[PDB]
Amino acid sequence: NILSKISSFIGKTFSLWAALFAAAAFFAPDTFKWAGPYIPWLLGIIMFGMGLTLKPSDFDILFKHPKVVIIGVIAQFAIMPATAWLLSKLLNLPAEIAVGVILVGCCPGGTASNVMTYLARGNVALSVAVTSVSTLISPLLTPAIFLMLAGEMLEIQAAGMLMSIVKMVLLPIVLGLIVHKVLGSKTEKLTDALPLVSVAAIVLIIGAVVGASKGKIMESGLLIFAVVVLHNGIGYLLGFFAAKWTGLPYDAQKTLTIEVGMQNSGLAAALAAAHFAAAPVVAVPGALFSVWHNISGSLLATYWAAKA
Ligand SMILES: C[C@H](CCC(=O)NCCS(=O)(=O)O)[C@H]1CC[C@H]2[C@@H]3[C@H](O)C[C@@H]4C[C@H](O)CC[C@]4(C)[C@H]3C[C@H](O)[C@]12C
Ligand SMILES: CCCCCCCCCCCC[N+](C)(C)[O-]
Ligand SMILES: CCCCCCCCCCCC[N+](C)(C)[O-]
Numbered sequence: 202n203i204l205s206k207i208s209s210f211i212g213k214t215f216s217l218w219a220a221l222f223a224a225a226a227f228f229a230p231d232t233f234k235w236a237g238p239y240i241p242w243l244l245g246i247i248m249f250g251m252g253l254t255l256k257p258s259d260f261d262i263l264f265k266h267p268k269v270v271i272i273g274v275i276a277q278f279a280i281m282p283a284t285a286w287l288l289s290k291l292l293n294l295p296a297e298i299a300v301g302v303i304l305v306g307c308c309p310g311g312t313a314s315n316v317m318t319y320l321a322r323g324n325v326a327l328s329v330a331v332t333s334v335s336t337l338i339s340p341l342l343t344p345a346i347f348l349m350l351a352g353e354m355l356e357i358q359a360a361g362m363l364m365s366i367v368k369m370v371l372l373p374i375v376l377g378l379i380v381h382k383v384l385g386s387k388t389e390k391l392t393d394a395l396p397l398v399s400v401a402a403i404v405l406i407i408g409a410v411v412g413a414s415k416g417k418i419m420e421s422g423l424l425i426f427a428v429v430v431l432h433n434g435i436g437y438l439l440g441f442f443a444a445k446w447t448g449l450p451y452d453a454q455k456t457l458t459i460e461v462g463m464q465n466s467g468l469a470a471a472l473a474a475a476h477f478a479a480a481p482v483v484a485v486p487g488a489l490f491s492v493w494h495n496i497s498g499s500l501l502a503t504y505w506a507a508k509a
């Protein structure tokens with residue numbers, strides 16, 4: 202009874218706990234630095250969890266309303282990478298920061314958009330369908346768009362990103378999805394444990410990244426945070442207008458706004474740690490985005506839940 206309520210609070214106060222661990226790692230780097238080589242395994246557990254909660258019925262909307270899901274997928278991969286490039290150009294960001302921002306923008310959407318849409322009284326089915334499709338196609342789209350925006354000079358790194366996404370995202374999702382088919386309704390007991398496990402895995406990624414880049418956060422941390430807010434914020438703005446201008450209903454307009462603005466920034470932190478390890482600042486936009494988008498996502502979801 203107490204253990205279940207503890208998980209409920211932690212989930213409903215995530216951003217605060219993520220901010221506390223990021224702060225703990227900042228003032229004391231050695232507290233989390235050990236988790237650095239575990240980043241792929243940690244993200245691998247989060248992705249296993251996503252697939253475990255996935256069922257073939259979650260793709261119903263993709264077969265019944267394919268144009269609506271396709272608009273959401275296009276919005277995601279056109280808006281977030283282009284906004285990351287535009288902000289990198291307009292703010293003349295140092296190359297390492299620009300690469301970290303572009304990486305975040307090229308990532309697929311985050312699963313927390315599903316919960317935020319539910320609170321925003323949006324179309325939940327659509328949110329789940331957009332995140333899942335954009336995630337399943339991310340092994341090809343994430344490095345291809347990264348390559349076009351960051352430059353063809355990072356070919357080697359982008360090719361390695363394809364392999365990294367297959368291993369940390371695709372391999373665990375499919376596995377989870379087949380385990381749900383194998384056990385059926387029995388997977389509910391496993392899915393009760395995942396919110397706390399997933400929160401523990403992500404705070405360790407955040408902690409490990411902040412710790413490894415303390416010096417770079419000390420000189421550029423505020424600039425990265427300002428870009429994160431503008432990247433995510435503009436993502437909500439263009440997301441809303443993309444849903445509105447395509448003639449989508451109000452429920453779909455709220456889902457796509459959140460979908461676009463919210464990113465799988467834990468993947469961006471994982472890809473920067475695996476492929477730009479000698480430059481710890483590349484993983485910083487991803488680590489700070491993971492804390493920020495949950496704060497901005499909840500505030501926007503609260504405004505809509507209060508309106509509806
Ligand atoms: C379940 C949480 C939302 C809680 C909520 O619904 N609050 C509203 C309160 S109320 O109704 O008004 O009472 C969300 C918000 C932050 C999310 C987490 C963060 O985004 C960080 C990672 C992101 C990963 O992709 C999924 C696991 C995860 C660890 C997320 C799990 C879960 O979706 C969380 C914890
Ligand atoms: C339930 C766990 C799901 C399996 C997740 C698979 C994660 C693969 C990550 C291996 C990382 C090794 N490394 C760093 C050398 O690439
Ligand atoms: C555009 C990406 C498509 C994602 C693929 C989703 C797989 C679930 C689709 C249901 C397949 C099961 N079946 C054959 C019975 O329909």
Ligand code: NA
Nearest residue numbers: 314315328332
């Ligand atoms: Na979603």
Ligand code: NA
Nearest residue numbers: 310460461463
């Ligand atoms: Na997104």
